Amino acid sequence: DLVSCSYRSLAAPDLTLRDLLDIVETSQAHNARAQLTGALFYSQGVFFQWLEGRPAAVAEVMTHIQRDRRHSNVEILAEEPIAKRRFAGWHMQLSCSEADMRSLGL
Amino acid sequence: SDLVSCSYRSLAAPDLTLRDLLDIVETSQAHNARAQLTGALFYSQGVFFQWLEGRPAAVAEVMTHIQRDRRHSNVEILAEEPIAKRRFAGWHMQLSCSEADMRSLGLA
Ligand SMILES: Cc1cc2nc3c(=O)[nH]c(=O)nc-3n(C[C@H](O)[C@H](O)[C@H](O)COP(=O)(O)O)c2cc1C
Ligand SMILES: Cc1cc2nc3c(=O)[nH]c(=O)nc-3n(C[C@H](O)[C@H](O)[C@H](O)COP(=O)(O)O)c2cc1C
């Protein structure tokens, strides 16, 4: 009994670096206790995310994530059953480039 | 003027190597440049996300091939989303691959 959820979203046009850092730090905290793992990819106003865990916990955050106003167009979440975890060890691995971080700075 | 965008998420074939990844990018670069396809590829831990932007038909034609590709599977796609402006202009194939992922894909 273990599942994954994959979505693509368009980051708020006004998204700052502070916003990104907040998203990451909350996720770290929640996924940690809530036993979720995965990765968050940001570049140039686009989010990809992969969440994995128990269907219960994923549904929990995914309802929260969708309400979140730091992005929009939260697009066809692809709910796949998984045999094993893919990001064991990463309660939230951010993947954000040096350029992208510079941008969100300006 | 007439730009659409396509997003998908893939599962890398379980025997995918660093060389494979490198082949996927160089092919993409060469092609996307000629086809005016811009976008980004993210790989980590067996997972691929990609965002492609360009004129409707170019996106459509590459996506048929991307889906044929044996180096991955379970290609869940996102209906041609129309876009105001490009987002990765200049980038024909911006790659996201961590140093850790680089280590693993390069093991055996
Ligand atoms: C792109 C994006 C990805 C997010 N991913 C997670 C996540 O994986 N885990 C999580 O707990 N919150 C994530 N969040 C934050 C939640 O949407 C939400 O802000 C928060 O978790 C719910 O309120 P809280 O601060 O009380 O926990 C994400 C937000 C954004 C915009
Ligand atoms: C994850 C992934 C992403 C790919 N992205 C592109 C791309 O954006 N542009 C491209 O021409 N080929 C891309 N390819 C390669 C194509 O699937 C396809 O194989 C190629 O364009 C035609 O065959 P070839 O590899 O022998 O040249 C990608 C392959 C994979 C597995």
From TrEMBL, chain A:
Residues 2-93 form the BLUF domain. FMN binds at N31, Q49, D68, R70. It comes from the Bacteria. This is AppA, antirepressor of ppsR, sensor of blue light. It comes from Cereibacter sphaeroides (strain ATCC 17023 / DSM 158 / JCM 6121 / CCUG 31486 / LMG 2827 / NBRC 12203 / NCIMB 8253 / ATH 2.4.1.). The gene is appA. The chain holds residues 15 to 120 of 450 of the full protein.
